[PDB]
Amino acid sequence: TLNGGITDMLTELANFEKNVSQAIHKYNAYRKAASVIAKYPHKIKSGAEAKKLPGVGTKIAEKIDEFLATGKLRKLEKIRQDDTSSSINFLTRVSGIGPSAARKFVDEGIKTLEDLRKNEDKLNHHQRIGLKYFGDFEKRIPREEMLQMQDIVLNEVKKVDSEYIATVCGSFRRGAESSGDMDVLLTHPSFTSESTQPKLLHQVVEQLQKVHFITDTLSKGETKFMGVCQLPSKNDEKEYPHRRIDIRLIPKDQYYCGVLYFTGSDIFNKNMKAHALEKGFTINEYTIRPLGVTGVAGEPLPVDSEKDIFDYIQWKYREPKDRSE
DNA sequence: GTCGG
DNA sequence: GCTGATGCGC
DNA sequence: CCGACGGCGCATCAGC
Numbered sequence: 001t002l003n004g005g006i007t008d009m010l011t012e013l014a015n016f017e018k019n020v021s022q023a024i025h026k027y028n029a030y031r032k033a034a035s036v037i038a039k040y041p042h043k044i045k046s047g048a049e050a051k052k053l054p055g056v057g058t059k060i061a062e063k064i065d066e067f068l069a070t071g072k073l074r075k076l077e078k079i080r081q082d083d084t085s086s087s088i089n090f091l092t093r094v095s096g097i098g099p100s101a102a103r104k105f106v107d108e109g110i111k112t113l114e115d116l117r118k119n120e121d122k123l124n125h126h127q128r129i130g131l132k133y134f135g136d137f138e139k140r141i142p143r144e145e146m147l148q149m150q151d152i153v154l155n156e157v158k159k160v161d162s163e164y165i166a167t168v169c170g171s172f173r174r175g176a177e178s179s180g181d182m183d184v185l186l187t188h189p190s191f192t193s194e195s196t197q198p199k200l201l202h203q204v205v206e207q208l209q210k211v212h213f214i215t216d217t218l219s220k221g222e223t224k225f226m227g228v229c230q231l232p233s234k235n236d237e238k239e240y241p242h243r244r245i246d247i248r249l250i251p252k253d254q255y256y257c258g259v260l261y262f263t264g265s266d267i268f269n270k271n272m273k274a275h276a277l278e279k280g281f282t283i284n285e286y287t288i289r290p291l292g293v294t295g296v297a298g299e300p301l302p303v304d305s306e307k308d309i310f311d312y313i314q315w316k317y318r319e320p321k322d323r324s325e
Numbered sequence: 326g327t328c329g330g
Numbered sequence: 331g332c333t334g335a336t337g338c339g340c
Numbered sequence: 341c342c343g344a345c346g347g348c349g350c351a352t353c354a355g356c
């Protein structure tokens with residue numbers, strides 16, 4: 001509400017850069033700008049005022065003035081009314097269709113969902129599921145449903161082996177009232193970095209399939225599964241939307257570093273890493289390691305919980321819900 | 326497009 | 331058939 | 341003024 005108009009136009013520009021211009025860094029530049037401006041507690045009155053914020057520079061300051069004055073961006077009005085551009089940008093909303101496939105589809109007259117359905121034979125497996133669940137994939141997941149989704153995965157994993165440890169991370173773990181998808185982190189005492197188990201993820205994915213929880217597969221290997229799941233319907237009522245689910249199998253010795261990382265948020269991760277640095281540690285998704293006087297990173301430290309990582313860098317344990325930043 | 330080195 | 335590159339979505 | 345900006349796992353392609 002504060003600066004929704006500006007953050008909207010920045011977002012739109014970001015998407016044009018990513019899907020049409022194929023300029024992924026300008027995509028992140030516009031988004032970062034949109035994020036800082038979104039957290040800013042006043043209604044912006046000039047470009048110069050926005051420029052004081054980290055991530056907003058000369059050109060965004062220039063666009064903000066154009067918008068504050070005239071209500072629009074000449075550059076966006078033009079973009080909206082190029083057929084190629086808006087078609088390419090739209091097609092990218094299909095999972096498995098990125099800038100490259102989108103531009104290629106539009107190049108041969110394929111511009112809409114209708115055209116994709118007419119041309120199924122031109123789509124790879126991932127893209128077909130993306131097309132099939134197009135509306136379902138753009139829908140958020142209420143927290144109430146996340147909880148039922150969690151019960152199902154936790155219990156089914158328990159049934160396969162009591163030694164498995166599974167954690168639902170992402171915004172859900174941070175306490176959000178809605179999530180984009182479900183990201184499951186999985187480990188086993190048998191799986192470490194040192195270790196010689198090409199069936200650990202599989203056992204779990206096939207159990208989820210057997211109880212009809214997982215319905216489709218996007219990609220699946222020995223460490224990562226990406227697919228589609230669905231809550232069982234009432235036996236009476238409206239059947240549930242299909243949801244994206246990801247399952248990652250991580251060595252036990254790197255498991256709590258992974259939980260930390262995949263819980264985020266991004267800015268929290270960024271701040272944590274910076275503080276660690278100041279304390280003589282380098283944290284990444286897999287490990288925390290002591291830094292040497294010359295900057296050389298030592299061996300991975302023993303981590304048996306998330307709290308362990310906070311102790312190393314002398315930070316009071318931060319509740320997931322307090323990791324917005 | 327914006328940044329820090 | 332093999333390998334490394336590219337596209338994709340986290 | 342300059343290159344960095346995240347980079348990993350998996351699926352498919354490109355070029356032998």
Ligand SMILES: Nc1ccn([C@H]2C[C@H](O)[C@@H](COP(=O)(O)C(F)(F)P(=O)(O)OP(=O)(O)O)O2)c(=O)n1
Nearest residue numbers: 170171178179180181261262263264265266269340
């Ligand atoms: N492209 C990515 C995305 C994520 N992550 C890791 C690093 C991130 O800390 C973590 C979660 O990403 P997140 O914070 O964005 C999210 F999913 F939880 P949020 O979008 O905020 O909520 P919601 O799904 O409802 O839209 O995964 C990553 O390594 N690469």
Ligand SMILES: [Mn+2]
Nearest residue numbers: 327328329330
């Ligand atoms: Mn600078």
Ligand SMILES: [Mn+2]
Nearest residue numbers: 341342343344
């Ligand atoms: Mn440059």
Ligand code: NA
Nearest residue numbers: 092094095097
């Ligand atoms: Na897409």
Ligand code: NA
Nearest residue numbers: 352353354355
């Ligand atoms: Na070929």
